Amino acid sequence: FVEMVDNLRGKSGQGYYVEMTVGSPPQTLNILVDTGSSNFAVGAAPHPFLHRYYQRQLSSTYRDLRKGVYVPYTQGKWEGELGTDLVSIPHGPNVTVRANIAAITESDKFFINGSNWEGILGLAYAEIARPDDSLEPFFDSLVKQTHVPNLFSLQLCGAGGSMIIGGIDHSLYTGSLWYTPIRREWYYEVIIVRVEINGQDLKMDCKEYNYDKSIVDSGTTNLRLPKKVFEAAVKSIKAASSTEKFPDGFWLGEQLVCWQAGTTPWNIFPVISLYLMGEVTNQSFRITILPQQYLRPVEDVATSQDDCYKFAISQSSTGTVMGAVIMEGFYVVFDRARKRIGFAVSACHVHDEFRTAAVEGPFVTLDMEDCGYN
Amino acid sequence: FVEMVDNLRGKSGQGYYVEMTVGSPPQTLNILVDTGSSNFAVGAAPHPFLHRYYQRQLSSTYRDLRKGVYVPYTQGKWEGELGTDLVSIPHGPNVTVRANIAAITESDKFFINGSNWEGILGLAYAEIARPDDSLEPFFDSLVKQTHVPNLFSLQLCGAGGSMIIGGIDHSLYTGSLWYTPIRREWYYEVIIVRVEINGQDLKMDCKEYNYDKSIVDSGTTNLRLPKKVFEAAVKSIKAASSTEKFPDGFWLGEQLVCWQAGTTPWNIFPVISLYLMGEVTNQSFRITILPQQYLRPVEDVATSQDDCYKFAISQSSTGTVMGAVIMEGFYVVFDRARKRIGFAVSACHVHDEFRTAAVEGPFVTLDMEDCGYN
Numbered sequence: 001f002v003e004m005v006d007n008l009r010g011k012s013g014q015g016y017y018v019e020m021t022v023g024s025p026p027q028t029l030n031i032l033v034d035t036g037s038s039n040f041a042v043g044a045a046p047h048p049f050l051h052r053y054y055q056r057q058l059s060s061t062y063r064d065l066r067k068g069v070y071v072p073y074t075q076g077k078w079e080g081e082l083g084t085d086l087v088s089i090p091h092g093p094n095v096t097v098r099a100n101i102a103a104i105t106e107s108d109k110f111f112i113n114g115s116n117w118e119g120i121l122g123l124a125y126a127e128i129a130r131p132d133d134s135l136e137p138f139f140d141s142l143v144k145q146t147h148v149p150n151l152f153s154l155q156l157c158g159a160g161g162s163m164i165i166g167g168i169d170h171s172l173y174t175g176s177l178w179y180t181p182i183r184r185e186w187y188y189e190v191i192i193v194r195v196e197i198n199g200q201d202l203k204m205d206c207k208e209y210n211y212d213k214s215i216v217d218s219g220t221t222n223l224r225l226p227k228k229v230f231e232a233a234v235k236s237i238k239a240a241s242s243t244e245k246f247p248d249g250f251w252l253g254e255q256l257v258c259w260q261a262g263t264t265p266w267n268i269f270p271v272i273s274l275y276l277m278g279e280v281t282n283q284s285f286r287i288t289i290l291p292q293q294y295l296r297p298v299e300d301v302a303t304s305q306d307d308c309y310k311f312a313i314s315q316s317s318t319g320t321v322m323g324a325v326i327m328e329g330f331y332v333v334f335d336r337a338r339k340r341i342g343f344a345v346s347a348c349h350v351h352d353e354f355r356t357a358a359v360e361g362p363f364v365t366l367d368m369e370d371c372g373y374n
Numbered sequence: 375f376v377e378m379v380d381n382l383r384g385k386s387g388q389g390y391y392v393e394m395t396v397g398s399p400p401q402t403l404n405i406l407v408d409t410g411s412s413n414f415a416v417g418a419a420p421h422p423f424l425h426r427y428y429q430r431q432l433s434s435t436y437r438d439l440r441k442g443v444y445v446p447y448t449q450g451k452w453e454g455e456l457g458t459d460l461v462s463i464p465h466g467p468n469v470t471v472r473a474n475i476a477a478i479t480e481s482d483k484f485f486i487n488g489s490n491w492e493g494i495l496g497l498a499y500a501e502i503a504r505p506d507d508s509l510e511p512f513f514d515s516l517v518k519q520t521h522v523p524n525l526f527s528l529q530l531c532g533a534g535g536s537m538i539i540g541g542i543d544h545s546l547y548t549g550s551l552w553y554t555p556i557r558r559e560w561y562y563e564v565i566i567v568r569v570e571i572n573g574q575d576l577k578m579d580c581k582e583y584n585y586d587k588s589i590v591d592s593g594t595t596n597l598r599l600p601k602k603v604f605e606a607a608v609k610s611i612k613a614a615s616s617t618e619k620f621p622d623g624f625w626l627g628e629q630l631v632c633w634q635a636g637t638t639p640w641n642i643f644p645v646i647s648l649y650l651m652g653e654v655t656n657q658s659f660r661i662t663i664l665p666q667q668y669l670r671p672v673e674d675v676a677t678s679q680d681d682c683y684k685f686a687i688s689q690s691s692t693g694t695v696m697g698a699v700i701m702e703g704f705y706v707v708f709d710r711a712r713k714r715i716g717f718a719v720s721a722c723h724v725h726d727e728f729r730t731a732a733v734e735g736p737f738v739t740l741d742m743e744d745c746g747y748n
């Protein structure tokens with residue numbers, strides 16, 4: 001797996017991507033690693049933001065499926081043509097598979113102007129595949145057609161990172177891996193059973209933490225929290241960090257907040273602990289994230305010249321989202337074979353000589369199933 | 375006001391815009407009419423999507439305010455330089471004012487590729503102005519510096535439309551105007567006190583309809599409803615329209631729905647009535663919207679060749695949003711002088727020889743203040 005170490009580039013701001021090849025002969029593309037979707041979708045026309053695009057005409061092995069997809073998002077859409085071709089990951093397992101590929105022919109507010117990737121690797125399950133659950137996702141194909149074991153792991157750094165296809169690499173984490181069940185195979189849905197801020201639980205019904213969903217999503221930047229839990233969550237961190245003062249707009253992601261080089265004090269800000277359903281009845285474990293995770297460098301502002309961070313927590317109609325900023329603290333194992341997700345302390349998380357990112361257990365938590373929304 | 379009739383172009387899909395001139399000599403720009411924000415912000419560099427941009431160097435009257443703004447949104451941002459200059463609306467009142475202008479120098483996922491406007495006319499109040507409430511919005515300046523009465527009205531058609539600055543035009547509506555109080559002058563916040571689907575109330579706590587906000591917003595396409603009310607809302611329309619069947623993804627705005635020319639039956643779909651707090655204690659009125667409003671032509675799809683509409687209702691962490699698709703049924707009067715918003719049936723709404731858009735009252739509704747979130 002030394003092969004696959006450091007095979008990712010990018011950042012929580014713009015996404016993490018892996019190099020892939022598609023078609024015969026191989027056309028190289030940079031492709032967003034997205035555990036929050038299930039389509040393998042690549043730019044296939046000369047949109048001006050794009051460095052590279054898939055040229056089906058140049059591939060002997062391409063096969064048209066004579067079917068189109070139209071894919072709207074909150075504020076983004078794409079449209080494309082469905083087909084299959086031969087797909088490989090240079091710095092992945094040494095195999096080549098025939099995968100579905102959506103050739104993206106039209107899009108709005110999808111590709112990022114200035115980014116270095118040209119497609120999306122949707123790594124979630126068939127259920128949320130577009131247009132329907134009969135379009136086999138890349139990873140299912142990879143598992144079906146080769147002997148690659150049914151799991152992958154992500155270490156997102158932005159301290160790029162590593163995607164280990166088919167296994168786990170011990171160099172990427174410290175301590176022990178703790179596993180939460182995948183509640184259902186659609187998104188990478190999990191159950192948060194308790195939340196503490198600094199060391200004190202919001203003491204709210206845990207069903208709220210997972211209303212209607214909680215998911216792990218390498219293609220969302222932030223920790224996203226339901227309206228009702230975002231209210232409470234911010235209420236507590238806001239009050240936790242009453243040393244200094246910050247505007248109302250900041251907490252709603254409406255303006256950035258700034259300090260000078262070094263003058264950002266993490267320590268006004270509390271660590272955050274999410275307790276996840278464990279593998280055993282009445283057993284949980286917890287993951288603890290630092291302020292460095294929830295306050296992210298907004299790299300360039302010419303209208304300022306300060307350490308200006310954005311508050312990396314936000315609200316949602318669609319549930320908890322554990323995003324890149326949460327994942328950056330951890331080695332995360334998507335153990336599809338066993339319907340579970342493993343978390344360990346990332347060997348590349350950013351830590352002072354004070355606090356740290358932590359994965360701890362067992363804890364005793366009763367009635368954890370009741371925390372899920374049906 | 376015949377002057378100002380038909381002074382808008384666009385559609386709920388891409389926005390409605392009015393022609394403005396800025397600087398001396400006049401530089402003409404098309405500018406989004408946005409009752410959901412409070413900044414006058416114009417493209418001021420050659421972003422390639424843009425037809426036109428503000429060139430401050432060409433204006434004798436421009437004045438730099440030596441201050442920058444950085445303005446993040448859910449998925450869009452812009453950055454610009456603050457200044458003032460002389461602003462006019464060719465097909466508006468014959469005046470010219472000195473307004474704040476944010477010269478947009480950098481942006482992502484803000485401007486629309488293929489659109490015909492280059493800036494935003496933020497018509498809401500100082501409270502939500504960026505960077506703070508001391509940046510005087512265009513409309514406050516217009517009222518301060520001229521004798522233009524403190525109100526405007528919008529007729530959004532997309533059957534373009536009309537913005538009447540300083541008054542009301544009787545040709546744009548039928549029947550009577552009914553007024554709901556502006557609960558607070560930040561957004562154009564209102565209070566929905568009851569909701570019926572086809573003719574039956576969701577029977578849920580009205581405080582939910584306005585959690586945390588309800589607003590009128592010409593720069594949002596959809597009717598947006600809180601998570602909890604969106605659930606119930608869809609539950610009822612879904613069941614209302616059980617003649618035919620549509621996928622789960624459709625209702626969540628995840629895929630479009632299609633029929634052939636003429637084969638879309640509105641009549642499987644129920645009319646929707648929102649009851650708004652009235653001007654008098656225990657008095658309300660109601661606005662009734664057709665399926666034509668909540669199911670919007672998604673104009674071009676090459677992956678299909680059918681009447682493919684998108685479901686124009688969606689959920690929100692930030693409240694009810696009465697958007698362009700709601701406003702298209704009505705003449706809407708933003709009567710800032712009297713802290714109220716008037717609704718009447720639009721003389722340009724689209725109606726069969728069956729149902730219609732309606733504004734009706736009085737109704738007796740007790741405890742309407744309790745419907746607002748504090």
Ligand SMILES: COc1cccc(-c2cccc(CC[C@]3(C)CC(=O)N(C)C(N)=N3)c2)c1
Pocket residue numbers: 011012013014015016032034035036037073074076110111112120217218219220221324
């Ligand atoms: C860390 O990942 C990032 C950061 C910033 C932007 C993106 C990004 C940009 C364009 C497209 C996508 C993919 C979007 C989607 C297919 C649908 C969606 O709403 N989400 C959140 C996911 N996960 N995948 C991501 C990813």
Ligand SMILES: COc1cccc(-c2cccc(CC[C@]3(C)CC(=O)N(C)C(N)=N3)c2)c1
Pocket residue numbers: 385386387388389390406408409410411447448450484485486494591592593594595698
């Ligand atoms: C009908 O209006 C539309 C339709 C489609 C897109 C827009 C649009 C495109 C780009 C920018 C904006 C302005 C956004 C904002 C300043 C912030 C925001 O989130 N909203 C909803 C509002 N109202 N104004 C609109 C407007």
